[PDB]
């Protein structure tokens, strides 16, 4: 089983839209995929897959679905419980997922918590969605404005470093991969392209991640969310919103994104 953990420091940058598209790409590639959502307050990924189950049940259409695992009988309430109860629920969900699935996708919220630390410690691949802007890069680390050398890694990056350190000191599993997925922004100014490219490459070198391409924000992802559908699901049998061509560029971005994660051999679409 391979464990993929999606996270970033503040929970933004389309993180849950990327997580649920990674899950459906691996389901259409024929894998069994578990999904564990550690954002106990907002549950964006868990709700997505509850919407998918409800929409498919109502339409009597069959599409692949992941094994969605909750950490307790009420994960919204679990958000306010002691961390030792949150860790217990996570360990039971992870044990089920490990017993049952080929990939385990764990979506994490912004911020630091015991369960987010534990998930990044167990990752084989950490995926960190990041918008292409100077303010966003500070969630990986601050750099000297002249030399672009790291002056302080973020708490997020320190957590990934600690997972890598422990994975080295144990030597029972393979090195963990870490990819930052850079989402292009429609507002990025051309005068900043060279400075943004240089800053993210300076961070990759000193923080130790590799860069892949992310997903541009598009209204279609928001329109599809309440149905639990991804761009990979759209077909002549599944078209829950007015037909448009608004999914073609998104489908190309998703192929490039999955290729950068090492997962092209395992990805499919409807």
Residue numbers in the entry: 4 to 273
Quoted passage from the original study:
This study analyzes the determinants responsible for establishing bipolar gradients of the ATPase MipZ, a key regulator of division site placement in Caulobacter crescentus. MipZ dynamically interacts with the polar ParB-parS complexes, forming a subcellular gradient with concentration maxima at the tips of the cell and a minimum at the cell center. MipZ belongs to the Mrp/MinD family of P loop ATPases, a heterogeneous group of proteins that act as nucleotide-dependent molecular switches (Leipe et al., 2002).
The two independent structures show excellent agreement with a root-mean-square deviation (rmsd) of 0.44 Å. In addition, it displays a number of unique features, including a marked extension of helix 2 and a large loop between helices 9 and 10 (helices 10/11 in Soj). Together, these distinct characteristics are consistent with a clear evolutionary separation of MipZ from its two relatives. Interaction analyses showed that MipZ monomers bind to ParB irrespective of their nucleotide state. Monomers are unable to interact with the nucleoid and, consequently, display high diffusional mobility, thereby rapidly returning to the polar ParB clusters.
